[PDB]
Amino acid sequence: GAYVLDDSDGLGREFDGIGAVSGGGATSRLLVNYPEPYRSEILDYLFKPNFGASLHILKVEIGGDGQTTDGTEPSHMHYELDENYFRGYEWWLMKEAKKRNPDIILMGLPWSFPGWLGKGFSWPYVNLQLTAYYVVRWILGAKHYHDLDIDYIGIWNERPFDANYIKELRKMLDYQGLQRVRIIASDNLWEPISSSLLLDQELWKVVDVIGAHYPGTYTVWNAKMSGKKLWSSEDFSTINSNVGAGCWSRILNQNYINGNMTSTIAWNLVASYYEELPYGRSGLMTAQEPWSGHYVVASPIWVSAHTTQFTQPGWYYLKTVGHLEKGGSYVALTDGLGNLTIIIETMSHQHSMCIRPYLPYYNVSHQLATFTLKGSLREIQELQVWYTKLGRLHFKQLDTLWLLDGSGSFTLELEEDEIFTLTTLTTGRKGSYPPPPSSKPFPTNYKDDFNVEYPLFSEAPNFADQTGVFEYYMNNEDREHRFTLRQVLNQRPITWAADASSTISVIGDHHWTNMTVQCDVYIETPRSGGVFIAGRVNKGGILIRSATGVFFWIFANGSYRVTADLGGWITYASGHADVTAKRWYTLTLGIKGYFAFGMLNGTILWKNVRVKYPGHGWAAIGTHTFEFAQFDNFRVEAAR
Ligand SMILES: *[C@@H]1O[C@H](CO)[C@@H](O[C@@H]2O[C@H](CO)[C@@H](O)[C@H](O)[C@H]2NC(C)=O)[C@H](O)[C@H]1NC(C)=O
Ligand SMILES: *[C@@H]1O[C@H](CO)[C@@H](O[C@@H]2O[C@H](CO)[C@@H](O)[C@H](O)[C@H]2NC(C)=O)[C@H](O)[C@H]1NC(C)=O
Ligand SMILES: *[C@@H]1O[C@H](CO)[C@@H](O)[C@H](O)[C@H]1NC(C)=O
Ligand SMILES: OC[C@H]1NC[C@@H](O)[C@H]1O
Ligand SMILES: [Ca+2]
């Protein structure tokens, strides 16, 4: 009936912010080659204050060269003695975020590590000091090369932690003058990190935040006992339709109400990766067409705004938050300066299902809510009102509510799937740019000669690495092939996912059925080396080992194979070929209906080879194992 909002008996927990994840893996891959002004507009919708999502927190993957869900991300240390702080796009993303919002909170976390750290094993805790050294170098580089202060460092995403590692990382940070950097652990479940902190005083002193993944709005007793800040350091991960926006809306409120969590961070920031990769379109918005410029400002963007535009890190929750009598919830926050924000959600079960977990049915029906301000809140007599309805009307501002009659009280009629924000703040704004170009398929004719002398990014556009890492490469010794694309991993990473045994980068339109793919290739390893081109590649990311399609391989021992699968278990054709190492060859692969053919230097090597049909997928290039190889003058023609 009536809900008392008071602060006279004190406040609840400090609010730490709302944010999102870029990474785990290659989720921002397709954003970097958006043309202007669209790329800038997209970043504004995400990071610009008082405009769109206005995010408080940005969390990025610390690339380790392994596959980490929708691709691989490059590391700052590919090999021992290698350091480079200009690979990939997370540096760039963090800088764009800081330009728009200097107060944004930055976090780094590893998913995978380069193999050389394991010293023969695939384990990051063999040499604690070395792994900490690797991680701390990343934090230093962010400062020295991009003027970025990293606020939080994590351990190993959804993977076991090592208590001695966490202690060494703290020791190492301090040694490098990074006392300011805080540690969050362990980006997995509540246990065993929570009990470990109660049993080990030394561990407790070095962990600042307990971050848990997909907690279902609840926490556990040991985490409450620790007295640490508790965050949902990864949540959401749901398609950004209205139902994903509902999920996001409900948990933003109820993570604090049910679980004492004072921050929630969504995976992922923006869907800039091919939709047919795992968890397609699971970002706060969509930008998966840099060639057309088309992007979609999805419902979750405005759901966020209901909290982010009217709260800041350092505000406090009121003690008086809770559930509504007939479904839904409410939270309230102040800044200690006279401001008050009230956020109300009535998301129904049918329209707010998250993928993890799925909630047992709960009823939500029409109701009346009376709110009464007490304590310092009593003198408030004016409140701005923002409204959203999911089904649809987004972040529309309504008429001001006045509490002039001295009752410090007001009443709202609530229905299902609504959000209300009531605040004393006048700065709210539904940001708006003109509509972007219409959606268009990947170009049916496409070419890249990789001839860029000073590239803005370390990899050519639209190539999404799914195992291994491909980079622009300048070779001054060669005139015809001075500027190529090169696979630079020479050993299997300490993996997060099940990376393939072969490296591979995919590109184009997953709908493609008929295609001709051409590329110049160069095998660097004598006798044992091999490369391939392919089409109809149907799976990537987490499932990259599963990929079928048509694969045209050549090897430096003088042979070729044609396979249905990346793993090379199923043969379509095979034979001998005039192929050696350290020599440029032109491969062509044509696939039409039931049949395929392959050319070596413009001459037929095999043709009319039966392949599975119907079938569809991307084009791709790659190498037999983790080995150096170069690629040049890529072209693809295809019918969708
Ligand atoms: C964590 O939040 C929970 C809410 O889920 C708090 O537990 C109590 O909640 C009930 C109603 O759910 C209130 O009537 C109690 O007053 C709350 N407890 C106290 C001590 O006030 C709990 O307080 C929170 N825990 C911490 C450590 O902040
Ligand atoms: C609500 O918040 C605003 C913004 O934080 C407060 O306004 C600021 O007040 C400080 C001093 O208290 C000034 O230094 C800033 O320049 C002000 N900024 C703006 C944008 O006005 C305001 O005092 C808070 N309280 C109320 C009742 O509005
Ligand atoms: C939900 O609640 C309303 C009002 O109490 C009731 O009429 C309706 O039958 C309920 N539905 C379910 C599925 O419980
Ligand atoms: O829900 C899937 C997400 N969890 C970890 C992140 O990398 C994604 O795989
Ligand atoms: Ca070239």
XYZ file of C-alpha atoms and ligand atoms in Angstrom:
720
model
C 0.000 0.000 0.000
C 2.213 2.785 1.321
C 6.013 2.662 0.987
C 8.121 4.745 3.375
C 11.255 6.298 1.886
C 13.380 7.551 4.766
C 17.000 8.271 5.671
C 16.654 9.367 9.292
C 17.945 6.013 10.577
C 20.829 5.971 8.114
C 21.698 4.849 4.614
C 22.223 1.531 2.879
C 25.289 0.573 0.891
C 27.323 2.851 -1.347
C 26.342 2.536 -5.031
C 29.345 1.654 -7.211
C 28.004 2.086 -10.746
C 26.576 0.340 -13.770
C 28.741 -0.862 -16.620
C 29.369 -3.289 -19.436
C 32.000 -5.664 -20.800
C 34.000 -5.307 -23.982
C 35.735 -8.605 -24.587
C 35.381 -12.311 -23.953
C 35.712 -12.274 -26.812
C 36.044 -9.904 -29.788
C 32.631 -8.441 -29.050
C 33.723 -5.000 -30.246
C 35.451 -6.425 -33.334
C 33.253 -4.861 -36.029
C 32.885 -1.450 -34.409
C 36.369 -0.140 -35.205
C 35.873 0.213 -38.977
C 32.527 1.997 -38.791
C 32.721 5.178 -40.871
C 32.152 8.587 -39.332
C 29.987 10.056 -38.025
C 28.309 6.778 -37.049
C 31.154 5.249 -35.044
C 31.277 8.411 -32.934
C 27.491 8.434 -32.528
C 27.542 4.830 -31.357
C 30.174 5.676 -28.751
C 28.043 8.620 -27.571
C 25.022 6.410 -27.066
C 27.212 4.257 -24.840
C 29.455 6.648 -22.937
C 28.314 10.244 -23.316
C 26.822 11.589 -20.063
C 23.163 12.636 -20.118
C 22.614 11.150 -23.565
C 22.235 7.374 -23.801
C 23.430 4.469 -21.663
C 25.808 6.927 -19.957
C 27.796 4.032 -18.478
C 29.677 4.379 -15.192
C 31.991 1.457 -15.772
C 33.859 -0.092 -18.699
C 35.356 -3.559 -18.335
C 37.644 -4.907 -21.046
C 39.391 -8.202 -21.740
C 43.146 -8.334 -21.339
C 43.836 -10.223 -24.562
C 45.798 -13.446 -24.273
C 45.621 -14.591 -27.915
C 43.132 -17.371 -27.169
C 39.507 -17.814 -28.299
C 37.275 -16.277 -25.641
C 33.726 -16.636 -27.042
C 33.298 -14.756 -30.334
C 36.915 -14.574 -31.373
C 40.458 -14.158 -30.134
C 41.937 -10.877 -28.878
C 45.617 -10.009 -29.247
C 47.989 -9.917 -26.308
C 50.558 -7.266 -25.443
C 53.129 -10.078 -25.200
C 52.856 -12.705 -27.955
C 56.237 -14.158 -27.048
C 58.750 -13.822 -24.258
C 60.595 -10.453 -24.656
C 57.786 -9.076 -26.797
C 55.993 -5.906 -25.684
C 53.523 -3.931 -27.766
C 50.746 -1.761 -26.376
C 49.026 -0.878 -29.637
C 47.365 -4.158 -30.682
C 43.614 -4.758 -30.849
C 40.939 -2.227 -29.978
C 40.467 -2.138 -26.196
C 43.042 0.670 -25.803
C 41.092 2.655 -28.357
C 37.744 1.842 -26.725
C 38.929 2.928 -23.296
C 40.188 6.245 -24.701
C 36.939 6.962 -26.499
C 35.069 6.233 -23.275
C 37.333 8.492 -21.209
C 36.955 11.352 -23.705
C 33.212 11.291 -23.301
C 33.340 10.603 -19.573
C 36.597 11.287 -17.678
C 35.126 9.853 -14.507
C 34.410 6.470 -16.078
C 35.638 3.467 -14.107
C 37.987 1.143 -15.993
C 38.521 -2.564 -15.296
C 40.807 -5.179 -16.844
C 40.472 -8.980 -16.649
C 42.167 -11.897 -18.433
C 40.318 -14.753 -20.173
C 43.310 -16.444 -21.785
C 47.109 -16.086 -21.594
C 49.930 -16.563 -24.112
C 51.359 -20.089 -23.991
C 54.906 -19.100 -23.111
C 53.687 -18.040 -19.639
C 52.832 -21.653 -18.852
C 56.441 -22.774 -19.324
C 55.499 -26.084 -20.933
C 52.123 -26.447 -19.232
C 48.773 -24.883 -19.999
C 48.473 -23.367 -16.538
C 48.895 -19.720 -15.499
C 49.905 -20.527 -11.921
C 53.130 -22.392 -12.648
C 55.198 -19.218 -12.130
C 53.175 -16.781 -10.028
C 55.592 -13.910 -10.365
C 55.704 -14.231 -14.165
C 51.938 -14.172 -14.641
C 51.643 -11.195 -12.278
C 54.482 -9.508 -14.192
C 52.577 -10.032 -17.440
C 49.373 -8.606 -16.015
C 50.989 -5.639 -14.301
C 52.860 -4.698 -17.511
C 49.431 -4.293 -19.114
C 48.325 -1.873 -16.431
C 51.558 0.129 -16.713
C 51.284 0.287 -20.484
C 47.738 1.606 -20.294
C 49.147 4.517 -18.290
C 52.379 5.145 -20.170
C 51.054 4.816 -23.708
C 47.401 5.881 -23.490
C 47.204 7.914 -20.287
C 44.681 5.450 -18.833
C 44.345 4.737 -15.138
C 43.043 1.203 -14.635
C 40.780 1.095 -11.590
C 40.228 -2.634 -11.067
C 42.173 -5.751 -11.943
C 40.652 -9.238 -11.866
C 42.098 -12.754 -11.760
C 41.009 -15.346 -14.362
C 37.522 -15.198 -15.875
C 35.278 -18.033 -14.657
C 38.385 -20.085 -13.967
C 40.025 -21.150 -10.694
C 41.928 -18.609 -8.673
C 45.108 -19.201 -6.731
C 45.321 -17.414 -3.380
C 49.086 -17.101 -3.597
C 48.699 -15.571 -7.050
C 46.304 -12.925 -5.719
C 48.781 -12.080 -2.937
C 51.684 -11.876 -5.434
C 49.652 -9.654 -7.769
C 49.017 -7.226 -4.863
C 52.718 -7.290 -3.924
C 53.670 -6.676 -7.564
C 51.194 -3.800 -8.066
C 52.517 -2.036 -4.978
C 56.108 -2.575 -6.130
C 55.321 -0.807 -9.395
C 53.699 2.158 -7.642
C 50.171 0.923 -8.414
C 48.789 0.959 -4.853
C 45.774 2.819 -6.232
C 44.703 -0.190 -8.307
C 42.105 -2.375 -6.605
C 41.615 -6.126 -6.946
C 38.350 -7.909 -7.673
C 37.889 -11.659 -7.266
C 37.240 -14.091 -8.560
C 34.825 -13.469 -11.418
C 33.194 -16.852 -11.067
C 30.836 -18.146 -8.341
C 30.517 -16.837 -4.781
C 32.531 -19.855 -3.615
C 35.226 -20.630 -2.948
C 36.365 -16.966 -2.887
C 33.925 -15.938 -0.127
C 34.832 -18.616 2.433
C 38.535 -18.187 1.605
C 38.321 -14.564 2.701
C 36.822 -15.502 6.108
C 39.530 -18.060 6.784
C 42.546 -16.105 5.540
C 43.216 -12.626 6.913
C 46.006 -12.025 4.398
C 43.733 -12.799 1.449
C 40.974 -10.637 2.939
C 43.337 -7.644 3.115
C 44.298 -7.853 -0.581
C 40.830 -8.402 -2.141
C 38.733 -5.223 -2.410
C 35.660 -6.503 -4.228
C 33.877 -9.824 -4.545
C 32.603 -10.045 -8.100
C 30.280 -12.925 -8.966
C 28.858 -14.019 -12.318
C 25.162 -14.546 -13.080
C 24.079 -14.663 -9.428
C 20.334 -14.625 -10.094
C 20.027 -11.443 -7.955
C 21.085 -13.366 -4.834
C 24.319 -13.613 -2.833
C 25.439 -15.953 0.011
C 26.028 -15.617 3.736
C 29.840 -15.824 3.593
C 29.942 -12.893 1.141
C 27.715 -10.758 3.405
C 29.970 -11.669 6.324
C 33.150 -10.547 4.545
C 31.987 -6.950 4.637
C 33.357 -6.506 1.106
C 31.643 -4.736 -1.735
C 29.685 -7.294 -3.766
C 29.228 -6.842 -7.501
C 27.476 -8.696 -10.247
C 30.658 -8.425 -12.288
C 29.033 -10.219 -15.204
C 25.328 -10.522 -15.982
C 22.760 -10.040 -18.784
C 24.217 -11.955 -21.787
C 20.734 -12.046 -23.379
C 19.470 -11.006 -26.845
C 18.777 -7.261 -26.837
C 15.110 -7.493 -27.794
C 12.471 -6.073 -25.460
C 12.734 -9.237 -23.346
C 16.463 -8.721 -22.826
C 15.727 -5.146 -21.853
C 13.215 -6.509 -19.348
C 15.783 -8.880 -17.865
C 18.263 -6.018 -17.591
C 15.674 -3.734 -16.028
C 14.607 -6.188 -13.342
C 18.103 -7.254 -12.248
C 19.487 -3.715 -12.173
C 17.020 -3.147 -9.312
C 16.918 -6.537 -7.648
C 20.658 -7.315 -7.569
C 20.864 -4.771 -4.769
C 17.503 -5.535 -3.198
C 17.927 -9.319 -3.003
C 21.687 -9.646 -3.084
C 23.318 -6.509 -1.645
C 25.158 -6.066 -4.918
C 26.123 -2.454 -5.462
C 27.193 -2.775 -9.078
C 26.002 -4.734 -12.108
C 28.055 -5.154 -15.321
C 26.550 -6.525 -18.527
C 28.179 -8.857 -20.989
C 28.439 -7.344 -23.474
C 28.839 -3.623 -24.241
C 27.787 -3.629 -27.888
C 27.068 -6.435 -30.331
C 29.807 -5.735 -32.909
C 30.429 -9.320 -33.945
C 28.765 -11.571 -36.545
C 25.322 -12.618 -35.270
C 25.834 -16.284 -36.124
C 28.715 -16.414 -33.669
C 27.757 -17.618 -30.146
C 25.303 -15.417 -28.237
C 24.656 -13.188 -31.246
C 23.157 -9.753 -30.561
C 23.699 -9.898 -26.790
C 24.986 -6.367 -26.244
C 23.265 -3.288 -24.859
C 22.927 -2.246 -28.494
C 23.770 -3.532 -31.965
C 26.476 -2.388 -34.387
C 27.347 -5.330 -36.614
C 27.542 -3.719 -40.067
C 30.533 -1.373 -40.464
C 30.243 -1.681 -44.271
C 26.734 -0.162 -44.322
C 26.915 2.043 -41.227
C 23.668 0.592 -39.902
C 23.368 0.220 -36.135
C 20.429 -0.347 -33.783
C 19.955 1.566 -30.529
C 18.225 -1.288 -28.711
C 15.844 -1.130 -25.718
C 18.576 -1.986 -23.169
C 20.264 1.358 -23.877
C 17.266 3.225 -22.439
C 16.716 0.757 -19.611
C 20.243 1.669 -18.484
C 19.554 5.391 -18.717
C 16.771 5.038 -16.135
C 19.533 4.349 -13.639
C 22.753 5.758 -15.095
C 21.555 9.240 -16.050
C 20.240 9.781 -12.524
C 22.819 8.037 -10.353
C 26.579 8.265 -9.977
C 29.210 6.110 -8.267
C 29.422 7.426 -4.720
C 25.694 7.896 -4.225
C 24.147 5.742 -1.480
C 21.135 3.431 -1.552
C 18.418 4.216 0.963
C 17.749 1.597 3.609
C 14.167 1.708 2.331
C 14.163 -0.326 -0.876
C 12.052 -3.398 -1.595
C 9.452 -5.320 -3.556
C 5.993 -4.077 -4.540
C 2.924 -5.805 -3.120
C 1.718 -7.175 -6.460
C 5.041 -7.634 -8.284
C 8.057 -5.571 -9.284
C 10.434 -3.538 -7.156
C 11.790 -0.120 -6.236
C 15.145 1.335 -5.228
C 16.044 4.833 -4.054
C 19.304 6.727 -3.855
C 20.678 10.049 -2.679
C 23.915 11.939 -3.203
C 23.947 13.523 0.244
C 23.429 16.947 -1.356
C 19.651 16.981 -1.416
C 19.070 14.921 -4.526
C 16.897 11.811 -4.650
C 16.346 9.240 -7.383
C 13.616 6.617 -7.302
C 13.678 3.755 -9.799
C 10.620 1.545 -10.221
C 10.278 -1.622 -12.321
C 7.296 -3.937 -12.883
C 8.765 -6.425 -15.345
C 6.545 -9.450 -15.879
C 7.921 -12.952 -15.941
C 7.055 -13.601 -19.553
C 8.973 -10.528 -20.698
C 12.123 -10.492 -18.583
C 13.602 -13.980 -18.831
C 17.387 -14.048 -18.609
C 19.335 -16.949 -20.025
C 21.104 -17.467 -16.684
C 19.176 -18.280 -14.578
C 15.607 -18.875 -15.712
C 13.203 -17.756 -12.963
C 10.198 -19.814 -11.849
C 6.963 -18.036 -12.782
C 5.899 -15.039 -10.699
C 2.744 -12.992 -10.961
C 2.720 -9.252 -11.756
C -0.542 -7.306 -11.974
C -1.884 -3.739 -11.840
C -1.355 -1.877 -8.591
C -1.261 1.428 -6.757
C 1.897 2.595 -5.067
C 1.891 5.313 -2.451
C 5.273 6.766 -1.588
C 5.975 8.884 1.471
C 9.140 10.870 1.965
C 10.561 11.166 5.486
C 13.728 12.488 7.103
C 15.586 14.939 4.876
C 13.442 13.800 1.961
C 10.368 15.507 3.434
C 11.257 18.977 2.169
C 11.292 17.752 -1.446
C 8.207 18.989 -3.319
C 9.191 18.555 -6.969
C 10.224 15.461 -8.942
C 11.082 14.958 -12.606
C 9.522 11.894 -14.210
C 10.845 9.527 -16.873
C 8.872 6.619 -18.294
C 9.422 3.489 -20.381
C 7.021 0.818 -21.629
C 8.337 -2.436 -23.105
C 6.384 -4.372 -25.747
C 6.569 0.316 -27.072
C 7.725 3.718 -25.686
C 11.294 4.461 -24.610
C 12.622 6.931 -22.004
C 9.917 9.544 -22.590
C 9.776 12.346 -20.045
C 6.436 13.003 -18.343
C 4.994 15.996 -16.542
C 6.520 16.998 -13.232
C 4.940 15.635 -10.040
C 4.382 18.211 -7.282
C 4.281 17.463 -3.550
C 3.245 20.974 -2.543
C 0.460 19.983 -0.147
C 3.016 19.174 2.565
C 2.180 15.466 2.548
C 5.587 14.551 1.115
C 3.534 11.870 -0.546
C 2.355 10.817 -3.977
C 0.670 7.900 -5.677
C 1.346 6.105 -8.955
C -0.766 3.635 -10.898
C 1.470 0.856 -12.178
C 0.962 -1.686 -14.925
C 3.140 -4.508 -16.256
C 6.504 -4.139 -17.970
C 7.001 -0.475 -17.020
C 9.910 1.583 -15.652
C 9.624 4.888 -13.808
C 12.410 7.157 -12.639
C 11.603 9.955 -10.214
C 14.410 12.343 -9.543
C 15.264 15.840 -8.427
C 17.867 15.953 -11.194
C 17.091 18.161 -14.181
C 19.885 16.936 -16.451
C 18.099 13.966 -18.000
C 18.014 13.728 -21.776
C 16.987 11.250 -24.427
C 19.954 11.686 -26.745
C 19.241 11.504 -30.440
C 21.153 11.370 -33.681
C 19.488 11.118 -37.086
C 18.774 7.557 -38.253
C 21.748 5.611 -39.709
C 21.739 3.894 -43.156
C 19.474 0.853 -43.661
C 20.717 -2.682 -43.033
C 22.628 -4.224 -45.930
C 24.279 -7.628 -46.420
C 28.047 -7.988 -46.546
C 29.217 -6.879 -50.055
C 28.934 -9.724 -52.587
C 32.209 -8.591 -54.086
C 34.996 -7.753 -51.656
C 38.758 -7.345 -51.788
C 41.676 -6.478 -49.525
C 45.292 -6.075 -50.585
C 46.349 -5.114 -47.033
C 48.445 -2.269 -48.415
C 48.400 0.114 -45.443
C 51.729 1.443 -44.220
C 50.599 2.957 -40.938
C 47.337 1.192 -40.036
C 45.127 2.655 -37.322
C 44.461 -0.836 -35.947
C 46.759 -3.875 -35.854
C 44.453 -6.045 -37.991
C 42.612 -5.582 -41.300
C 38.840 -4.878 -41.027
C 36.118 -7.563 -40.937
C 38.591 -10.411 -40.396
C 37.457 -12.029 -37.149
C 40.110 -14.365 -35.760
C 38.597 -17.502 -34.238
C 41.873 -19.266 -33.451
C 45.289 -17.686 -33.732
C 45.951 -13.996 -34.337
C 46.299 -12.190 -37.684
C 48.091 -8.868 -38.042
C 49.155 -6.343 -40.654
C 52.725 -7.137 -41.618
C 55.287 -5.018 -43.466
C 58.136 -6.864 -45.149
C 60.656 -4.462 -46.670
C 62.658 -7.252 -48.279
C 59.825 -7.997 -50.706
C 58.439 -5.594 -53.316
C 55.364 -7.436 -54.615
C 54.389 -8.531 -51.096
C 55.585 -5.666 -48.920
C 52.272 -5.415 -47.076
C 50.549 -8.648 -46.120
C 48.423 -10.245 -43.402
C 50.293 -12.610 -41.064
C 49.355 -15.226 -38.472
C 51.725 -14.481 -35.582
C 51.094 -17.154 -32.953
C 53.819 -19.822 -32.764
C 52.323 -21.874 -29.919
C 48.944 -22.755 -28.446
C 47.795 -20.203 -25.819
C 46.799 -21.068 -22.246
C 43.244 -21.441 -23.447
C 39.901 -20.384 -22.011
C 37.849 -22.153 -24.635
C 38.579 -25.140 -26.812
C 40.620 -23.362 -29.513
C 41.046 -25.279 -32.767
C 44.275 -27.117 -33.608
C 44.460 -24.953 -36.721
C 44.337 -21.155 -36.839
C 41.481 -19.477 -38.690
C 39.970 -16.058 -39.348
C 36.476 -15.756 -40.821
C 34.898 -12.988 -42.866
C 31.804 -12.061 -44.844
C 28.177 -13.173 -44.805
C 27.152 -16.364 -42.982
C 24.235 -16.707 -45.417
C 26.596 -17.177 -48.395
C 26.119 -20.465 -50.272
C 27.972 -19.982 -53.552
C 31.297 -18.322 -53.423
C 34.683 -18.008 -54.969
C 37.484 -17.228 -52.545
C 40.948 -16.258 -53.728
C 44.092 -15.439 -51.744
C 47.881 -15.414 -52.075
C 49.471 -17.556 -49.365
C 52.991 -18.015 -48.008
C 54.095 -20.897 -45.759
C 56.996 -19.933 -43.510
C 57.826 -23.344 -41.981
C 59.827 -25.844 -44.079
C 58.566 -29.411 -44.657
C 55.809 -29.365 -42.055
C 53.936 -26.116 -42.739
C 50.480 -25.727 -44.215
C 47.803 -23.133 -44.941
C 44.259 -23.078 -46.245
C 41.368 -21.054 -47.632
C 37.728 -21.993 -47.080
C 34.045 -21.298 -47.575
C 30.696 -22.228 -46.046
C 32.310 -22.113 -42.595
C 29.251 -22.476 -40.382
C 30.415 -22.146 -36.753
C 32.973 -20.092 -34.848
C 33.739 -18.698 -31.413
C 33.310 -21.166 -28.568
C 32.362 -23.764 -31.160
C 35.234 -23.105 -33.577
C 36.434 -26.745 -33.314
C 33.010 -27.720 -34.665
C 33.313 -25.785 -37.907
C 32.285 -27.521 -41.100
C 32.447 -26.107 -44.626
C 34.870 -26.627 -47.505
C 38.571 -26.379 -46.707
C 41.312 -26.197 -49.349
C 44.663 -27.042 -47.741
C 48.173 -26.975 -49.145
C 51.301 -28.265 -47.394
C 55.027 -27.595 -47.746
C 55.748 -31.316 -48.190
C 54.155 -31.080 -51.625
C 50.522 -32.050 -51.091
C 46.946 -30.812 -50.801
C 43.753 -31.892 -49.040
C 40.111 -30.911 -49.351
C 38.111 -31.387 -46.149
C 34.561 -30.891 -44.852
C 35.804 -29.896 -41.396
C 38.391 -27.602 -39.802
C 39.721 -30.594 -37.874
C 40.527 -32.363 -41.141
C 38.773 -35.592 -40.212
C 36.549 -35.793 -43.304
C 38.126 -35.883 -46.779
C 36.508 -34.609 -49.973
C 39.687 -34.911 -52.050
C 43.463 -35.063 -51.668
C 46.640 -35.414 -53.714
C 50.055 -34.085 -54.693
C 50.916 -30.500 -55.597
C 53.956 -28.439 -56.554
C 54.122 -26.634 -53.226
C 57.092 -25.808 -50.993
C 57.888 -23.433 -48.121
C 58.873 -19.785 -48.472
C 57.140 -19.309 -51.817
C 54.061 -17.304 -52.826
C 51.138 -19.205 -54.341
C 47.675 -18.101 -55.405
C 44.845 -20.307 -54.138
C 41.361 -20.149 -55.601
C 38.379 -22.076 -54.200
C 35.032 -22.145 -55.995
C 31.916 -23.644 -54.438
C 28.568 -23.919 -56.203
C 25.704 -26.184 -55.133
C 26.882 -29.782 -54.795
C 30.328 -29.231 -56.307
C 33.589 -27.432 -55.717
C 36.888 -26.823 -57.495
C 40.317 -25.536 -56.556
C 43.032 -23.709 -58.442
C 46.738 -23.316 -57.881
C 48.178 -20.261 -59.649
C 45.189 -20.024 -61.986
C 45.407 -23.687 -63.012
C 42.857 -26.319 -62.024
C 44.175 -28.675 -59.372
C 40.853 -30.414 -58.750
C 37.264 -29.879 -59.875
C 33.725 -31.245 -59.728
C 34.370 -32.605 -56.264
C 31.109 -33.363 -54.481
C 30.536 -31.448 -51.261
C 27.601 -31.417 -48.831
C 24.684 -29.271 -49.942
C 22.707 -27.356 -48.896
C 25.202 -25.583 -46.645
C 26.208 -21.997 -45.910
C 28.802 -19.966 -44.017
C 31.650 -17.432 -44.046
C 34.864 -17.336 -46.050
C 38.106 -17.962 -44.184
C 41.900 -18.250 -44.184
C 44.280 -20.060 -41.846
C 47.229 -22.284 -40.999
C 47.660 -25.956 -40.157
C 48.984 -25.362 -36.642
C 50.175 -22.391 -34.602
C 52.742 -21.377 -37.227
C 53.868 -18.239 -39.095
C 52.210 -17.706 -42.484
C 51.344 -14.735 -44.667
C 48.347 -13.880 -46.816
C 47.892 -11.254 -49.529
C 45.412 -9.925 -52.118
C 42.304 -11.453 -50.600
C 39.165 -11.512 -52.713
C 35.758 -13.115 -52.420
C 32.747 -13.139 -54.724
C 29.550 -14.680 -53.393
C 25.829 -15.212 -53.803
C 23.662 -15.032 -50.674
C 21.750 -7.274 2.598
O 20.515 -7.065 2.128
C 19.530 -7.782 2.865
C 18.282 -7.668 2.032
O 18.200 -8.769 1.137
C 19.406 -7.177 4.264
O 18.688 -8.057 5.122
C 17.552 -7.539 5.865
O 16.456 -7.339 5.043
C 15.227 -7.305 5.782
C 14.099 -7.390 4.777
O 14.501 -8.157 3.650
C 15.206 -6.045 6.642
O 13.996 -5.969 7.389
C 16.397 -6.070 7.593
O 16.466 -4.861 8.343
C 17.705 -6.324 6.831
N 18.801 -6.528 7.776
C 19.322 -5.536 8.509
C 20.454 -5.914 9.415
O 18.909 -4.378 8.442
C 20.784 -7.004 4.924
O 20.727 -6.080 5.998
C 21.899 -6.591 3.955
N 23.180 -6.967 4.541
C 24.241 -6.160 4.586
C 25.444 -6.715 5.275
O 24.229 -5.038 4.085
C 22.024 17.819 -6.868
O 23.131 17.557 -7.701
C 23.653 18.703 -8.387
C 24.762 18.184 -9.269
O 25.663 17.388 -8.511
C 24.138 19.739 -7.370
O 24.562 20.916 -8.055
C 25.972 21.168 -7.861
O 26.242 21.736 -6.584
C 27.643 21.913 -6.323
C 27.760 22.386 -4.893
O 26.879 21.670 -4.037
C 28.234 22.892 -7.336
O 29.634 23.033 -7.112
C 27.981 22.391 -8.753
O 28.418 23.361 -9.699
C 26.494 22.101 -8.960
N 26.265 21.527 -10.277
C 25.124 21.689 -10.953
C 25.054 21.018 -12.292
O 24.189 22.346 -10.504
C 23.023 20.086 -6.393
O 23.543 20.905 -5.350
C 22.421 18.818 -5.778
N 21.288 19.141 -4.921
C 20.119 19.628 -5.359
C 19.084 19.884 -4.306
O 19.905 19.861 -6.547
C -2.156 -13.392 -11.026
O -2.808 -12.543 -10.065
C -4.131 -12.115 -10.431
C -4.613 -11.192 -9.333
O -4.447 -11.767 -8.041
C -5.032 -13.332 -10.630
O -6.320 -12.897 -11.056
C -4.427 -14.267 -11.661
O -5.210 -15.453 -11.769
C -3.001 -14.654 -11.270
N -2.407 -15.507 -12.277
C -1.635 -16.558 -11.977
C -1.112 -17.340 -13.137
O -1.370 -16.856 -10.809
O 27.213 -15.806 -21.069
C 28.369 -16.018 -21.864
C 29.465 -15.046 -21.479
N 30.124 -15.460 -20.224
C 31.575 -15.148 -20.339
C 31.672 -14.342 -21.620
O 32.972 -14.429 -22.207
C 30.609 -14.991 -22.495
O 31.017 -16.291 -22.883
Ca 49.667 -6.526 -50.297
